[PDB]
């Protein structure tokens, strides 16, 4: 009966499917974040480098640097919290075993 039940419905393994999906979604948003202007005139560094003279080019880069650095910090903090809950579940699993 257990083999039949596991072979029938997919709503049982949501616990592991969510572990996969949250990571995929977070990293996907991290990639998407490279397309925003963050207040600049272009989202492509090559363009900001090709255009403008050396002084202003760097100034626009700074706006980009600040925004992307903020995005990285947000992603890292969320990963730290997620890892703690994964380890809490791992300790529970070890005790049950």
């Amino acid at each position: 009966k257990i083999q039949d039940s596991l072979s029938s419905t997919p709503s049982a393994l949501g616990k592991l499917q969510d572990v996969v999906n949250q990571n995929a979604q977070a990293l996907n948003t991290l990639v998407k974040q490279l397309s925003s202007n963050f207040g600049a005139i272009s989202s492509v560094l090559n363009d900001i480098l090709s255009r403008l003279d050396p002084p202003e080019a760097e100034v626009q880069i700074d706006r980009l640097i600040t925004g992307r650095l903020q995005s990285l910090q947000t992603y890292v903090t969320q990963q730290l919290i997620r890892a703690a809950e994964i380890r809490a579940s791992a300790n529970l699993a070890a005790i049950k075993m």
Partner: protein, 379 residues
């Protein structure tokens, strides 16, 4: 590398990550459209007579080659302020469409020409858009357009019911009802003609003098651009990651025969990260894809420093058929390369381990590497 990363003079046994490894490009490739005729910028800058500021003329320039150096190096221009553009990279960068807006104003209203300011001509007959990109060029032309009796062919629009749209041009001469009562005819009490005439004479001082202005309204790189400077094109090579240049698209990566079908109005193919992923040659109508050539991290496996100073090297995620191509002829981010001597090489799912000897005896995992392989310092 490990000691410098740890910022200490002793290194404990284990695996340590260091600076990432990335293959440098070898040669430069530039591909501009091979049109040759020069753009008649002289026909706009040295044009006989411009139209009035209320009826500024617009000319389209395309299918030609420009030169902005001769414009930036000319000392005649009094003000040259650019928006998201620089004359230094103008004989290089390309242009979707080049439109020359030509008109004449008073010297005091020169500041109003820039986007975002206001005034009697700025809000009435010429406003630039909020996100305007381009560059405006202005200079006095009193000795060219002033007459002793007064120049009266130049007029501006003084009254309108509501402010105009960007680049809007109003030619109507409807009489403005400044008073509350309606009026008609040529003129009436508190019914002014919308245009006001100037009085340019040689005796006027600075600020009130006429300033000949010419403006460009180009847009960039979001369309199949057609016009740019005299930068000469070279040949293209394949399967080697180089810093290519297609119509001002600076970049670096290995280019390979693609299979996507751009529509005739489409020139670029963009990925999730809003970066270019495929390119069409501006000289032949084939389509190619761009991939960043191989890169990855480097980890250094060492035992106790007091025990020995011999080390190994591992590249995460790098198939080491490339590292023979990673010969120290071109530039490489890691300077040290003597370890690629060979026959001390082994491949893992985690990358290629170089400088260590493969055996069959199994043991407890001393230093974890990945995919079940573990290294250990042993006799």
């Amino acid at each position: 590398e490990t000691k410098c990363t740890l910022k200490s003079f002793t290194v404990e046994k284990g695996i340590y990550q260091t600076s990432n490894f990335r293959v440098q490009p070898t040669e430069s490739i530039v591909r501009f459209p091979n049109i040759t005729n020069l753009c008649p910028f002289g026909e706009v800058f040295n044009a006989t007579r411009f139209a009035s500021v209320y009826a500024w003329n617009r000319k389209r320039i395309s299918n030609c080659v420009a030169d902005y150096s001769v414009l930036y190096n000319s000392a005649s221009f009094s003000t040259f302020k650019c928006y998201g553009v620089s004359p230094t990279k103008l004989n290089d960068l390309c242009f979707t469409n080049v439109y020359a807006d030509s008109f004449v104003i008073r010297g005091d209203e020169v500041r109003q020409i820039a986007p975002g300011q206001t005034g009697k001509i700025a809000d009435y007959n010429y406003k630039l858009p909020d996100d305007f990109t381009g560059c405006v060029i202005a200079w006095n032309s009193n000795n060219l357009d002033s007459k002793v009796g007064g120049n009266y062919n130049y007029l501006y629009r003084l009254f309108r019911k509501s402010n105009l749209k960007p680049f809007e041009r109003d030619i109507s001469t409807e009489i403005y009802q400044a008073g509350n009562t309606p009026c008609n005819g040529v003129k009436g009490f508190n019914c002014y003609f919308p245009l006001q005439s100037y009085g340019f004479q040689p005796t006027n001082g600075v600020g009130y003098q006429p300033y000949r202005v010419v403006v460009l309204s180009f847009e960039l790189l979001h369309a199949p651009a057609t016009v740019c400077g005299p930068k000469k094109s070279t040949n293209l090579v394949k399967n080697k990651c180089v810093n290519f240049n297609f119509n001002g698209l600076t970049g670096t990566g290995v280019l390979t025969e693609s299979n996507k079908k751009f529509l005739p109005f489409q020139q670029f193919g963009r990925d999730i990260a809003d970066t270019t992923d495929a390119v069409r040659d501006p000289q032949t109508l084939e389509i190619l894809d761009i991939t960043p050539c191989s890169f990855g991290g480097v980890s250094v496996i060492t035992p106790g420093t007091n025990t020995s100073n011999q080390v190994a090297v591992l590249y995460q995620g790098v198939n080491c058929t490339e590292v023979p191509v990673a010969i120290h002829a071109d530039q490489l981010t890691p300077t040290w390369r003597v370890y690629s001597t060979g026959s001390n090489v082994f491949q893992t799912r985690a990358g290629c381990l170089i400088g260590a000897e493969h055996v069959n005896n199994s043991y407890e995992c001393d230093i974890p590497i990945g995919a079940g392989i573990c290294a250990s310092y042993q006799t």
